[PDB]
Structure 1
């Protein structure tokens, strides 16, 4: 059995001797058809409180099918910042057959104040995102359910619970999923301590974005008010003053990301607008603070990193985008992976470099050392 996790600060980008952005070796975390008829999709990447690097994704049996294909959430771990990886472990295993259960679309949320790690994902029976019915009974086979897996030992062992009920206050909400990738712990302003992740829902209004949050460090979850229309997988990031930003996939396919702001820790959001500067093919993406610990008013606090497929129509060209100004503008886009990338994610590693994941015939990992950042967003 493993030691209990101890509180520790999230990592910040550190400087490197690199002068430009250069992908490191490509590591093949999981390869489709290894073993036969097994497919891998939907990446999540986090740095656990002990500095371990953790990669989560779906194992999909038979084909790469979404929920209700009876999937499993699996993980691999690096103790040396991406260099080498342990073998796969199961977070939660699905079961096949008439009474199939599926666990699918993972996101991490690391709490630095306690060392605990969360892995959100769906729990499916017979119904997917689109065909799920209204109802919150844990055994309802027509409901797409929300599960959270909790680890207190840096991601070695997990325990499971359905959070569907406590995050459904509008009874017409017929479906939900936490967006895969990573949520956040707030570190600044009046809501510091709050844990938060973004959902996509369908309700009587339309297909909306919706925050779920915890002020008791992950024992209970509550849903904020929903926002927007034609919303899809969206991610929340804490801006330099503790204002929150949501960055969203656009189910209407404008060719762009969508963005909204919250002044109350995700309880309420304002208007959803296009981000003209962020070309997206209607696809998942991740936005993260480069220096999460940095205080309001500093130059480090306003730096956001963003990965997506920078293309209007196709999920190709995994691109790191940089904002120096709390996401008001995007001054730099650089493709780190030409060709098919599918869903991409990124996270700051404990050595201060950036870790990335993308989908190409399974799940692939690489590292972007970060020394070159000062020349795009100066620190003084």
Structure 2
């Protein structure tokens, strides 16, 4: 006869409805001799001012996210509470044998969006006919306000059990393209059966089209995923992705293949996928020095189109069956994706790597630290010839990498050229999604700022037209893909 309690720590945005603050779970249904349950809670005046209404929600599901994020797959009743009240009661009959209770709120309109712009509440008492039950707290509540915050892909959406691997792209016309692994049966990588799914926004991420499967996987060893995105200088959209067996199961004669698809109408329609594995490695490769290589995949998220028009993604390539490590090469095209070539080797024992354009026209590459090498720090390299040749740049190091994909944006802050990098803070785990700012002139990283506390993994970022940052992250143990919008001052002033 015990209650367990979880405070909620997901972000919120103005005017959102029925946002959970804390939820509690009874160990058992109320007994037949129970007439009413009554829950007492604490809620600071600072939180009270930022909400317009409270509610007690009752459900037969114990959910991770806000109940409306499940688009009806969670069933609940909702009972309002005056914001000034600190207790509420409900009849056993109305609970109808259910065990999961949520204290939720409607978020007001005003906001300052600073680091201290947070919301919290705590359940202090759950009494059944005046008998307090033992209460155990597993997590506190702290919900930060952002300019935008929306779960774009939630486990269960459209009948897929899971979602992973976010990719985000803003077009020259302002269209937002969001893509992801639709991980149908569970959260594991290829060779599992996986689709590529998409949603679009034409209003800067205020609203999003219904999700559309654009590449359908056809069974185990026949799925697709790990999408990266660019817009070419001629204006076409380009996705690149892998499909087939797993990374370490690929071979020269039976590869996990690399594909590209293009769109000429802002992501509405896409060309039938085109196998470009033969430009890279394996049995159909024209370069005999790469015909015995085993595997290649481009880092999911975004590529980079250079000022010349050269299209680039970083591939991480397995050259030997005698080792489980990868080497980085830039995959590029100077003819709008018609043909593809590889740079010289950019990193030895690398992994998922990302590119960004330096103020002086050099290319900066950020390299995932796979295998807890060295000091468990993120790796960096530099190229001065548009990605053809590379050199390690230790002076950019200085942030921890638990072994996870992330992203870079070149931005101006207070007149000064800086790199914004997204990565889990950890330590040594995929936890607390954070961003850092690297100052070009001083060569020092900022202290991290945690955007989403809790389990956090892959992230992609884009610069919106008005300077806001779109931040697309893997939140939680069973992952939802979440689009968050903030400006730099919200995080760093």
TM-score between the two structures when normalised by the length of structure 1: 0.82
The answer to whether 1:175 aligns with 2:304 is: no
Q: Tell whether the 8 Å contact from 2:396 to 2:443 is kept in structure 1 after alignment.
A: no
In the TM superposition, what is the alpha-carbon distance from 1:37 to its structure 2 partner?
5.2
The answer to whether 1:47 aligns with 2:160 is: no
DSSP-derived class of the 1:256 partner: coil
The answer to whether 1:151 aligns with 2:263 is: yes
Q: Tell whether the 8 Å contact from 2:329 to 2:347 is kept in structure 1 after alignment.
A: no
**Mapping of 1:1-380 within 5 angstroms?**
20=114, 23-36=146-159, 38-96=161-219, 101-111=222-232, 113-124=233-244, 127-135=245-253, 142-159=254-271, 160-168=273-281, 169=287, 170-187=290-307, 192-204=308-320, 207-254=326-373, 255-271=376-392, 273=394, 276-290=397-411, 302-325=417-440, 328-360=443-475, 361-371=479-489
Residues 1:55 and 1:31: Cα distance change in structure 2 (over 3 Å): same
Residues 1:327 and 1:350: Cα distance change in structure 2 (over 3 Å): farther
In the TM superposition, what is the alpha-carbon distance from 1:283 to its structure 2 partner?
0.6
DSSP-derived class of the 2:351 partner: strand
Residues 1:339 and 1:372: Cα distance change in structure 2 (over 3 Å): closer
In the TM superposition, what is the alpha-carbon distance from 1:24 to its structure 2 partner?
2.9
In the TM superposition, what is the alpha-carbon distance from 1:55 to its structure 2 partner?
0.8
Superposed CA deviations along residues 217-253 of structure 1, whole A, max 9, x for unmatched, are 2222111112333211110111111111110111131
CA RMSD of aligned residues (A): 2.5
- 1 CA distance for matches of 2:168 and 2:442? 22
Q: Tell whether the 8 Å contact from 1:43 to 1:358 is kept in structure 2 after alignment.
A: yes
- 2 CA distance for matches of 1:299 and 1:281? 32
The structure with more radius of gyration: 2
In the TM superposition, what is the alpha-carbon distance from 1:275 to its structure 2 partner?
5.2
Q: Tell whether the 8 Å contact from 2:471 to 2:484 is kept in structure 1 after alignment.
A: yes
Superposed CA deviations along residues 183-236 of structure 1, whole A, max 9, x for unmatched, are 11112xxxx221111111111495111101111122221111123332111101
Q: Tell whether the 8 Å contact from 1:240 to 1:326 is kept in structure 2 after alignment.
A: no
- 1 CA distance for matches of 2:398 and 2:146? 23
- 2 CA distance for matches of 1:326 and 1:89? 44
Q: Tell whether the 8 Å contact from 1:258 to 1:274 is kept in structure 2 after alignment.
A: no
Superposed CA deviations along residues 74-112 of structure 1, whole A, max 9, x for unmatched, are 111111112111111222111126xx521111111122x
- 2 CA distance for matches of 1:57 and 1:215? 27
- 2 CA distance for matches of 1:208 and 1:194? 21
Q: Tell whether the 8 Å contact from 2:239 to 2:260 is kept in structure 1 after alignment.
A: yes
Superposed CA deviations along residues 340-364 of structure 1, whole A, max 9, x for unmatched, are 1111111112332100111123211
In the TM superposition, what is the alpha-carbon distance from 1:36 to its structure 2 partner?
4.6
Superposed CA deviations along residues 285-339 of structure 1, whole A, max 9, x for unmatched, are 1112236xxxxxx956x32211110223111111121123179432352111111
TM-score between the two structures when normalised by the length of structure 2: 0.64
- 2 CA distance for matches of 1:306 and 1:162? 32
Residues 1:322 and 1:219: Cα distance change in structure 2 (over 3 Å): same
Residues 1:281 and 1:35: Cα distance change in structure 2 (over 3 Å): same
Which residues of structure 1 form unaligned runs of 5+? 1-16, 136-141, 292-297
DSSP-derived class of the 2:458 partner: coil
Residues 1:286 and 1:259: Cα distance change in structure 2 (over 3 Å): same
Which residues of structure 2 form unaligned runs of 5+? 1-110, 116-144, 282-286
Q: Tell whether the 8 Å contact from 1:186 to 1:195 is kept in structure 2 after alignment.
A: yes
**Which structure ranks higher in relative contact order (CA pairs < 8 Å, sequence separation ≥ 6)?**
1
Q: Tell whether the 8 Å contact from 2:160 to 2:182 is kept in structure 1 after alignment.
A: no
Residues 1:91 and 1:313: Cα distance change in structure 2 (over 3 Å): same
Q: Tell whether the 8 Å contact from 2:461 to 2:471 is kept in structure 1 after alignment.
A: yes
Q: Tell whether the 8 Å contact from 1:304 to 1:327 is kept in structure 2 after alignment.
A: no
How many aligned residue pairs are there? 338
